[PDB]
Design a protein around this nucleic acid. Structure first.
Ligand SMILES: [K+]
Ligand SMILES: [K+]
Ligand SMILES: [K+]
Ligand SMILES: [K+]
Ligand SMILES: [K+]
Ligand SMILES: [Mg+2]
Ligand SMILES: [Mg+2]
Ligand SMILES: [Mg+2]
Ligand SMILES: [Mg+2]
Ligand SMILES: [Mg+2]
Ligand SMILES: [Mg+2]
Ligand SMILES: [Mg+2]
Ligand SMILES: [Mg+2]
Ligand SMILES: [Mg+2]
Ligand SMILES: [Mg+2]
Ligand SMILES: [Mg+2]
Ligand SMILES: [Mg+2]
Ligand SMILES: [Mg+2]
Ligand SMILES: [Mg+2]
Ligand SMILES: [Mg+2]
Ligand SMILES: [Mg+2]
Ligand SMILES: [Mg+2]
Ligand SMILES: [Mg+2]
Ligand SMILES: [Mg+2]
Ligand SMILES: [Mg+2]
Ligand SMILES: [Mg+2]
Ligand SMILES: [Mg+2]
Ligand SMILES: [Mg+2]
Ligand SMILES: [Mg+2]
Ligand SMILES: [Mg+2]
Ligand SMILES: [Mg+2]
Ligand SMILES: [Mg+2]
Ligand SMILES: [Mg+2]
Ligand SMILES: [Mg+2]
Ligand code: NA
Ligand code: NA
Ligand code: NA
Ligand code: NA
Ligand SMILES: [Zn+2]
Lengths: 122, 52, 116, 52, 89, 77, 53
RNA sequence: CGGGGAAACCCCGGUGGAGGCCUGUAGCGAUGCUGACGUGCAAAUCGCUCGUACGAUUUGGGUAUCGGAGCGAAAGACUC
RNA sequence: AUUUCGUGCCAACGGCACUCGUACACGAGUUGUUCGGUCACUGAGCACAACGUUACACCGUUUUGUUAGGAAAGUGAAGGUGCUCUGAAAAGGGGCAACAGAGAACCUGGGAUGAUAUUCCAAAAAGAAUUGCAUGUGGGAC
RNA sequence: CCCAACUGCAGACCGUACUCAUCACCGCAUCAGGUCCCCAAGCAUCGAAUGCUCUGGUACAUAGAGAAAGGUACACUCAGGGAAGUCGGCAAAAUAGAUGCGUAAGUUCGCAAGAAGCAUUGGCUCUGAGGGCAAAAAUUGCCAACUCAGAACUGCUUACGGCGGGGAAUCCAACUGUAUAAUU
RNA sequence: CUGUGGAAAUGCGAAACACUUGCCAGGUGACCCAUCCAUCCUCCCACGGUGAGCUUUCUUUUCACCAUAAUCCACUUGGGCCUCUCGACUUCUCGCGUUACUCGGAGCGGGGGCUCAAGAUUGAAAAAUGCAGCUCACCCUACGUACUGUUGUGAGUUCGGCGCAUUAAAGCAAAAACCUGGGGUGUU
């Protein structure tokens, strides 16, 4: 509230950066991949979906050299020097599953630090 | 503001006392009004000193 | 905003039944009684009634159990008078007595002169 | 319930080792610290008590 | 006389009680709330504390005086009469 | 509760009769010994794990020793 | 009409036990009820079976 | 704090927060509809509207004064 | 003043209804060194004693420091004896009246109940404390 | 015999369930009447006004079907006229917040006064003013809160709740207050 | 040595700094509005980690939770006071300070200190507790065992500052109990 805001700048915001850098979030999808629910087409879609939907500085589809969405052995890994909230990647995963059908089969939990794990319903 | 300037010795006690009573008398509208008056006071004091 | 109840068996808001609100380790808001305070020792009322230095303000139970030093001072009239009033009494005692002695000598000398 | 003020005067007990406190109606001009003398040999001054 | 032409301190009473009764109480009210001269310490610091009791803010002395003024006119003549009568003896 | 300031007075307290038990608490990066006497609980803190196991092992077997853990509801019945 | 001290003494004489606490209340019907806690050296269940329960 | 004046003294702008002061909740009352009900919800109640609301203000417990007597800012009011 | 809780139950009662109930029946429940009162304060006040009055106490006085023409103190400073005599000083009889005034040493957690809890918890007391008396030992002084 | 720091043992009596009210108290009763104290959320707004809502609590008041007249209402609307109604403008209608400008006779000079009266008010995108803390200081950097004043564009069916009608005179009592519980 | 340190404000506590209901004197108990600043606590924001809600399209999103009792040990703000400045308005009009009605040779201000009140920080208590999650993990019927998580310059708010303290022809109860001293006894 030091400077008055304007409607023209509603879609833009500064992101704020880390000091030491090199923070990585992981998502594990081994269980659905082992079964037939997560075919490699879905895995490719999953990695692709994260690519054009992660929002940097207020805009999506324009993340380079600061956010890496590399995917290796069924574990999506996001490496960044930007400052993010861990719940954001849980919020993105739920949207992707809801766009597909599996929201009623697969649940997402926090297995450990900086990791999320996908498993089955009962 | 007046207390800070006196501590920094940018004004003396005689100037401080006169401006203290004028602020209580509703002469300065805001902070910028007070600084401009102080700058004017500092200027004509310097000119008189150099003339003497 | 949770609401509280009186926990003792007096339910009136007097100067002695004053309560504070406390949050417990179990995440509950309860009422706890804060006791009264004392005004502390003072100088005599007819001498100004001022708060004495070097003495604490203690209620009945705490004043009885406290060490003597917390309510007194090493000088004469320790926890009764301030140092100005003590100095006034000393000066008054000496000067008045000297004046009394002066008069007695003056009167006796006058009697001697009359005798001669 | 009273218009006139009252005065608290402190005396020494004539026969015992104790102090006596009295309460009288104050004449105009009485002040705290004043000395009051009562008796046949008291002088004529404001605040003294004398036989008629 | 910027805020009020003539009412003065009696301006808290609005338009009640009549003009003359308000005037008669204005003289005594002004003196009762004023600061009077202390002959003990030389300051203008005497104030009233209940009717007839006057206390000095400087030397903390309490005197018995008049209801609305520190010294009544009758008191001064009595003081001089007594002093003259005492020295007469 | 009272705090023990040095090893010397800790040994005096432990040797003292009416010492009901000694409870040993293994916090991270610190270790506490709590001696339950009458009317008061005395505590001694040690910063290093070494020179603390030695103190624990050098306790008279007459004194009852307890290792503090977290007990479940069923364990507390 | 009995108080706690006499209740404690009477229990010791009748049943040869040591108590650590005695609590009492007066019932709404007028009778007085007492809760008596025994020492850890004595078994409440054993005493109850001796009396016949 | 500024102006005006030879003086006596006068004037503007602020600050301050007085009053059995005003509008208005709770509270304490009871003006009109001569409204509702009038074998009632009620042996005096209900609805809108209305008086006052820092004071001669409202209220709990305790205590004191009575039958030709008590009490009454006075209506012969009130005293289960 | 048992309406609280559990179980059963529908004759009468809850101006209609009931399988429901503050109904009916049978059994249960209220735990304190520290909470409130009291031990233990005074207030507006009351009225035992004493005195006076009345044909007759079932009447009057009884806090403006204070009963009674009125001998209402049964306490014991310094000192002597031994390991218990003599006596200084103290005027004004005995009570009651505040569960919002004065006063008052305890706090959280609980898997501890069908119903009570700052009142219950027992050796790792879930525990941590504060205060009233008596003692015995270790130490300073007689 | 006195004491400090410990330690050992013992800590008396009565109250304790439930209620405190549109069903537990007083009004013959589970009666729209009466009855002291404490705790008190979010948004609109000057707000303990009034309207809606999370927590906690309720769906308990005899119901179903269903456009007769006449009624009661803490319910409304009416062309043209506008008190002609009536003892009497009774009842209803009507004014209304905030901001800018302006305001009579009389007067005890305090008031009268919100006297009277005229104008503006939405939405959206912008602009200016009003401050703290750091530093070797008419400088630089970082940061909070919500008021006030303006401009362009665009719109109206005058559109929640809440909220004074005003003026000219006569009689009486100076004023605030009290006062016939149940016709003044 | 016979309590003791400091020029002073006044400090020092294992048990002689012992006793003082012979006596006397003070104090606590003990009483006062409003404005202003404002405690405990409440509500809002910021920071983000656990779980849920919505998701044709939007929303780095919406909701819940994020705790520390008594007791004990060891830098700020406000008031009072001491000392130095060989002590300020010497001199046409001195200085400090409040939102606010005033204060100063009967001792302002400035440097350094003593003390009281209210807080802050550090530690014992106290994580061993509480609250959530997981509970197709690893078990079998046990209230079972592992494991994971645990900033405000905002807006209100009478504890306190606060009384010789309100309008006043109104001036704000008393006592028990307790505290300290003057005298006196006591130690060498
Ligand atoms: K006002
Ligand atoms: K009105
Ligand atoms: K609800
Ligand atoms: K008019
Ligand atoms: K009025
Ligand atoms: Mg005080
Ligand atoms: Mg005398
Ligand atoms: Mg009991
Ligand atoms: Mg009014
Ligand atoms: Mg009618
Ligand atoms: Mg009203
Ligand atoms: Mg008549
Ligand atoms: Mg029926
Ligand atoms: Mg029954
Ligand atoms: Mg009395
Ligand atoms: Mg009380
Ligand atoms: Mg108690
Ligand atoms: Mg219950
Ligand atoms: Mg109960
Ligand atoms: Mg009712
Ligand atoms: Mg708003
Ligand atoms: Mg309301
Ligand atoms: Mg509201
Ligand atoms: Mg009905
Ligand atoms: Mg028409
Ligand atoms: Mg028309
Ligand atoms: Mg007509
Ligand atoms: Mg006609
Ligand atoms: Mg009308
Ligand atoms: Mg005019
Ligand atoms: Mg207008
Ligand atoms: Mg009238
Ligand atoms: Mg009237
Ligand atoms: Mg009537
Ligand atoms: Na008024
Ligand atoms: Na009593
Ligand atoms: Na209630
Ligand atoms: Na009902
Ligand atoms: Zn004076």
């Amino acid at each position: 509230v030091a400077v008055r805001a304007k409607v023209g700048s509603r879609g833009f915001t500064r992101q704020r950066q880390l000091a030491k850098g090199k923070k990585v979030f992981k998502i594990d999808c081994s269980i659905p991949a082992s079964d037939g629910i997560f075919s490699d087409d879905i895995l490719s879609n999953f990695q692709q979906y994260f690519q054009d939907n992660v929002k940097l500085n207020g805009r999506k589809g324009k993340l380079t050299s600061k956010v890496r969405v590399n995917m290796r052995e069924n574990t999506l890994s996001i490496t960044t020097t930007m400052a993010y909230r861990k719940k954001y990647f849980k919020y993105l995963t739920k949207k992707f599953l809801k766009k597909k059908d599996l929201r009623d089969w697969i649940r997402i939990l926090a297995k450990g630090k900086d990791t999320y794990q996908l498993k089955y319903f009962n | 503001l007046l207390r800070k300037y006196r501590e920094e010795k940018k004004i003396d006690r005689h100037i401080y006392r006169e401006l203290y009573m004028k602020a209580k008398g509703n002469v300065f509208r805001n902070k910028r009004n007070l600084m401009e008056h102080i700058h004017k006071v500092k200027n004509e004091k310097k000119k008189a000193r150099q003339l003497a | 905003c949770p609401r509280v109840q009186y926990r003792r068996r007096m339910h009136y808001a007097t100067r002695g039944n004053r309560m504070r609100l406390v949050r417990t380790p179990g995440n509950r808001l309860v009422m706890q009684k804060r006791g009264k305070r004392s005004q502390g020792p003072h100088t005599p009322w007819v001498l100004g009634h001022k708060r004495l230095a070097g003495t604490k303000a203690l209620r009945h139970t705490k004043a009885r159990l406290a060490p003597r030093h917390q309510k007194t001072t090493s000088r004469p009239y320790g926890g009764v008078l301030s140092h100005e009033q003590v100095r006034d009494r000393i000066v008054r005692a000496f000067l008045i007595e000297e004046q009394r002695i002066v008069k007695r000598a003056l009167k006796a000398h006058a009697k001697v002169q009359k005798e001669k | 319930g009273r218009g006139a003020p009252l005065a608290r005067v402190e005396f020494r007990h004539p026969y015992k080792y104790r102090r006596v406190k009295e309460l009288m109606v104050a004449p105009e001009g009485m002040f705290t610290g004043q000395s009051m003398l009562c008796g046949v040999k008291a002088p004529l001054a404001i605040g003294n008590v004398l036989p008629l | 006389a910027k805020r009020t032409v003539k009412m003065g301190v009696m301006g808290r009473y609005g338009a009640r009680y009549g003009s003359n009764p308000r005037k008669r109480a204005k003289k005594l009210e002004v003196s009762q709330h004023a600061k009077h001269f202390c002959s003990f310490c030389g300051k203008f610091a005497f104030r009233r504390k209940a009717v007839g009791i006057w206390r000095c803010d400087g030397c903390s002395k309490t005197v018995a005086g008049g209801a609305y003024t520190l010294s009544t006119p009758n008191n001064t003549t009595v003081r001089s009469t007594v002093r003259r009568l005492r020295e007469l003896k | 509760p009272r705090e023990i300031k040095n090893l010397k007075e800790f040994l005096a307290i432990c040797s003292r009769k009416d010492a009901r038990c000694v409870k040993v608490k293994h916090n991270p990066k610190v270790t506490k010994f709590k001696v339950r006497c009458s009317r008061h609980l005395y505590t001694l803190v040690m910063a290093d794990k070494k020179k603390a196991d030695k103190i624990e092992r050098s306790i008279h077997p007459s004194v009852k020793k307890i290792t503090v853990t977290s007990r479940s509801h069923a364990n507390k019945n | 009409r009995a108080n706690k001290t006499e209740i404690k003494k009477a229990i010791r004489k009748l049943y040869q036990v040591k108590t650590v606490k005695v609590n009492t209340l007066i019932r709404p019907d007028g009778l007085k009820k007492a809760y008596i806690r025994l020492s850890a050296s004595y078994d409440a269940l054993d005493t109850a079976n001796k009396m016949g329960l």
